[PDB]
Design a protein around this ligand. Sequence first.
Ligand code: HEM
Ligand code: HEM
Lengths: 379, 439, 111, 49, 446, 64
Amino acid sequence: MTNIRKSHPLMKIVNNAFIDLPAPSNISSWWNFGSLLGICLILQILTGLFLAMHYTSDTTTAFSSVTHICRDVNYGWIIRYMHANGASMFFICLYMHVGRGLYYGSYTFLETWNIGVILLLTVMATAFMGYVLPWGQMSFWGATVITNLLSAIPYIGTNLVEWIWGGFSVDKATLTRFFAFHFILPFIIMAIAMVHLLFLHETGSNNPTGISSDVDKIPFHPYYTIKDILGALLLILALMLLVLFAPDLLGDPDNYTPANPLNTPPHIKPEWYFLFAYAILRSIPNKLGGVLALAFSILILALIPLLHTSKQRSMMFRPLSQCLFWALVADLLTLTWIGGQPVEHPYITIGQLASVLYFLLILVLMPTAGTIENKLLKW
Amino acid sequence: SLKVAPKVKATEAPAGVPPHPQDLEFTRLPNGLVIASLENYAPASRIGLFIKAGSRYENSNNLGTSHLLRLASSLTTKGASSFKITRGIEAVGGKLSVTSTRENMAYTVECLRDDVDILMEFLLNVTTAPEFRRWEVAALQPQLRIDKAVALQNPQAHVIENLHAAAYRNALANSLYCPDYRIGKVTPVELHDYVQNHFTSARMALIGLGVSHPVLKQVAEQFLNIRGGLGLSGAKAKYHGGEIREQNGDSLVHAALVAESAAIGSAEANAFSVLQHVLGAGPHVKRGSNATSSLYQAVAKGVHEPFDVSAFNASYSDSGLFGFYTISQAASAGDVIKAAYNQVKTIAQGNLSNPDVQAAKNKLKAGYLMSVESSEGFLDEVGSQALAAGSYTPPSTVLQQIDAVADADVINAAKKFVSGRKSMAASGNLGHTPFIDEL
Amino acid sequence: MAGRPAVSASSRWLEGIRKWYYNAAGFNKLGLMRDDTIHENDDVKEAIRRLPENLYDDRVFRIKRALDLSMRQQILPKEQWTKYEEDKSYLEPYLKEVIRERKEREEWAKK
Amino acid sequence: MLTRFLGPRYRQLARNWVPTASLWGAVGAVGLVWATDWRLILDWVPYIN
Amino acid sequence: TATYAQALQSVPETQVSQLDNGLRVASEQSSQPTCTVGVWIDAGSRYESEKNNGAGYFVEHLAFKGTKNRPGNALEKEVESMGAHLNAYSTREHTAYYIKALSKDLPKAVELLADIVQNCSLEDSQIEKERDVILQELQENDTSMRDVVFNYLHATAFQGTPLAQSVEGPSENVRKLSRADLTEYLSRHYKAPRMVLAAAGGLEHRQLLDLAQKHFSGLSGTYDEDAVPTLSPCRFTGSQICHREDGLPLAHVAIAVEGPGWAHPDNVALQVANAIIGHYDCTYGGGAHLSSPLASIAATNKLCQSFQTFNICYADTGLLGAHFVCDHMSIDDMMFVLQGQWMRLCTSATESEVLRGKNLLRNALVSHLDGTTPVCEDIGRSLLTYGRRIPLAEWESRIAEVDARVVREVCSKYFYDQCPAVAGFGPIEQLPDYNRIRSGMFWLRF
Amino acid sequence: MVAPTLTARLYSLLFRRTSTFALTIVVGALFFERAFDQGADAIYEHINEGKLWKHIKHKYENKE
Ligand code: HEM
Ligand code: HEM
């Protein structure tokens, strides 16, 4: 405080959304993931840009350039692993951002929630092409099965797969296209994320109680900047723990052998954040059904706001729905466990039952849960 | 037309203009309500509910309740909501308006005769059983300022409101609009008290045009048995006589100098009414020079600038106000008032001619006949008649009463104004406008 | 959810389960009535605007203190909880009229 | 579609905007066909055969 | 048990009779003790070139100022002592002089009316005296936003045509007008074939015809000039006039398109379309509940303080549109929602709202014809525009034949894609550009 | 529609309603793009008669 501050027609007023923005006081710790997601996004761009200064997309010198990054570049080994393990932190933070909206009814912000699904699709697409960049027998084959799923579409399935592949199979043509696409997509995410906030600042946050918090708003700057800074450190501590103590804990060991189209890995599987999607697709013998269920499960988020039934909004005072919510989270963990395991007789039964429960809970049990409690509250 | 081929449909014996025009049925219920229905077989049907709940009946505490009650129409009732009333009335094209004087407050509905039963039900629910929800009444408060501001755009409205304020202390001095301090201070309990005290049968009268008597009779047998209350500033009126002067820098100066005339029904009121047209109370020829207007002709000499003088005759149930209204430039405001006032003094001194009285009687008879000529004017005339009196006087009988006014009675009426206690209300640039004492 | 008070109970009576669910919901522990936690749509928001000043101001403080309790992740003492029997619907009469008004308005644009 | 509820007012609304919605799908059909020369469709037009 | 359909037939039928020189004597018998009788003539601004523009207003002012038989105020003194009201109005196509009195006083009223028409005095001192009255009245009308805007709209909608002239005329024309032009104008436009003497009240048609035969027989209907010359068509011109003046608080805007005309049967369907849109002027008790979609929203969002839908009908053209009075920061916020309302009737109009408009039109006709003063105007004006006088029952027959399909077709023929004429006055900075206004005349392509 | 000038029939029939305004654009693009290529190629090969591979192919592919 020094003057009347004069001026004002500049970009500072746009920054009032970071300083003077009203915010609920009772915002819990499940909310730093909003700022953590922004921290993760600019972290991938920062490390990714320096990775792109030594990475070459040609198949003859793609894998060998990744080795040159770690072996030769000064401090180039850490940058590769905060990039590889940051995407693990990105999807760790991404799934709690979705989970909080499910629990606290944040999907009632229809504009923000719908843009959120678009943001989810963009990152999952971006992280898919990044895995193909190292070209390491998991990049080639992980991209082989997933992209070949598009062949189940009729009258365009074969045409667009080759159009996606740039040829008859995954090869140098596909690899160069992915690196260029992997470079641009994150900058699209920044623009959408700004649009994501633009649809939220009109209505503010969503206190865990679920009631309007207009009576108890507090300034953002002195209270939540220091709360997000602490949350950022817990992210850096968690990310750096993987990088400096178990860099390959999450990544598959088979990715360290150069891609060989003539040789198939013992077990072919995507990264851990797509494993739950793999389980749903593998649960149906049909090919067209599997790809649709793979897309429907991801795209079911847009259908959630149309399934609200409870007269309340947050699950704080909905004990019946709380039991179902953690059943869905547990089932989503069962899908992750199933995806990393080979298709044999103990897992086909478990995989089909978990997948049929994943859709049954959200489509039937959860809307019926809200209706039941409405009778129990005389409204 | 052309609904089935011949469809002489309604070529009946009376049908209005053909020899039988049908009379006006008059009936008084044992409750005390008055029902009057004239069946003219016209396509348009007009039903009016006349209530003795004027702006004068408000006391000092609940001033402006009548203004809000007049605005209170088209609000939620027990039988019909605000949405249903506005949508239901407008779908059939009907029109709902609320007239309101200092003494009466008429509720009128106009629509086609095919859907008169729907309009009657809406009128009864609005008039008798209003919910007066607090939120709805609260939202209507700013309309009081909007209505008063527009209605006060005409400078003559302000003077007339001040004229009754200056002349009277009691009921009749209340303005027709909510006071500047009462906008927003009116409460739903006050409206319920006003309705429960004044909207109660014996002060009502149901008048309809183009509706059969049993339809009117059956719909009107659901009313109350209460009378009016008391009031600090409104109850029984008593003439005081004063002077109110307002300055607002306007180019044109409006002045109203009046005395105490007689109440309606009284034979002295007719003397003032014919005296009103002796002095001239409105033009008859567009852009005319007003040769027969005694007031305008008297001020014409000397004053060679724009001006306008007429005769003001406000008459009520218990008292009245008679005088002249003037409009003149502030540079010569005093001359116009004084010249017009001196002309009235000559009338009081017996300087009147029989042809002057004969012309004024002709103007009075013609002016009254055209007033009831329209569909709306006829309803208002009989509607107020059924309230002030208990019977309908045909226009022919009225013409005899006007013709039975002696020329001496006109002179005595002039003497009452000249010798009476005056009440002056002025507006505009009052630099040269005279006071009462320098009359 | 937890064992029902009687012995274990599958579904006994109707008031017992509603009373059991009220304590399970836990909005009484924050000093909130049932209608203080409702979702504010374009209907409820109007029905709030019609609340009397004494009732509306009471609702504001009950919400204001509940957010203070949620901010500290605390609850009111055992004696300050909203009793299930003493809980009353202060918003149901106002909601019903807006239900009536909206249904009439919608059906008028349909007929 | 193009309505809000199931009533005579909305039924009249839907019918009144059918011819425009009728020919609007032609742009979606022909325009998509024009974009990628849909053969099965381009094989029936006489001048473009 | 007298239905609305049956009551319309009971209305007495207008009786029209023609004199020897072409004077049309019309009347409607009734039972009222009072009556009005007037003369409607084919005269106005549209019949005057630029040289004699505003002669009718000048002629009308001197009409009651003195006649050959009754010089000075004797003509006025006869009316006032008689108890009658004398009135006269003039527009771009018509002029009238109607006197309301007791039915027993009809013979004297007709005798006076003949004197005003045939025997105007036009004393040289009266023209000089009345010249200052017109000039003073011209300065008076400069403060009327409603009249100024409609003259602005007429100036550009029918620019370069006689219909663009104002009735009063330019001040320069008023100063330079002489007695020779006035008497020439009367001797050219005041003739029996282009005249109609109408009346309504407690008068028998036989008495009125005989009275007209006694007094109006001296009127001439010969070849004089061009044998009662006809008119010439005026071309509508899509344009825009904007008198931007920030001193005045409110903005008066009138936007209109070319209309069908007096005799075109599409006026009934268009009059139903105007009733659907309705009117609103900030003093309505309905507020947000008004059935008209535009009237209700203007009351909710507080867009305007007044707005009206009009259909001005002329010989072969007309103005059809709306005029609204709003804040200086609401001109755009309602002009484009006004146009959006027009596009709704043109594209998709529900049957129910046309029924609401039909009922509103039904009440407009019946309620307007109250008393006898509007009846004579309706009788006199119709015989100059429609030829015969249209009975109320016939009006209902045409009204009952209008449905949603007719309204959608009729509105789209005159409103959709047509170039409108815009007139503005006041703080009209927010008023959108004409291309923005023009692009509002169609949907999905703006 | 009822006028003796081509454009008046061309406007009311097609351009009056924006739905059919887009139809003539998409259909017009079909017929324009097909005729323009043949129109703009036949002129190009006239400038290069006996030059391109099309004009010297005939002396190859043995029996074809
Ligand atoms: C939201 C943004 C991003 C996500 C989620 C993401 C994700 C990934 C993932 C999962 C890998 C696989 C690494 C491995 O398994 O070894 C990868 C590799 C890679 N990414 Fe990204 N990335 C993002 C942005 C970027 C950007 C902006 C760039 C360049 C400017 C970039 C450049 C690279 C490169 C060169 C590789 C291969 C080198 C390596 O794998 O160590 N990335 N990315
Ligand atoms: C890179 C990806 C994303 C970024 C950077 C991002 C960023 C943000 C931020 C910073 C907030 C406000 C912080 C807060 O209120 O806690 C927010 C709010 C929100 N986001 Fe995202 N988000 C992303 C993806 C998503 C996803 C995958 C969803 C899935 C539903 C989503 C839906 C929402 C919702 C519902 C809110 C409402 C918050 C509230 O209730 O107050 N967003 N987003």
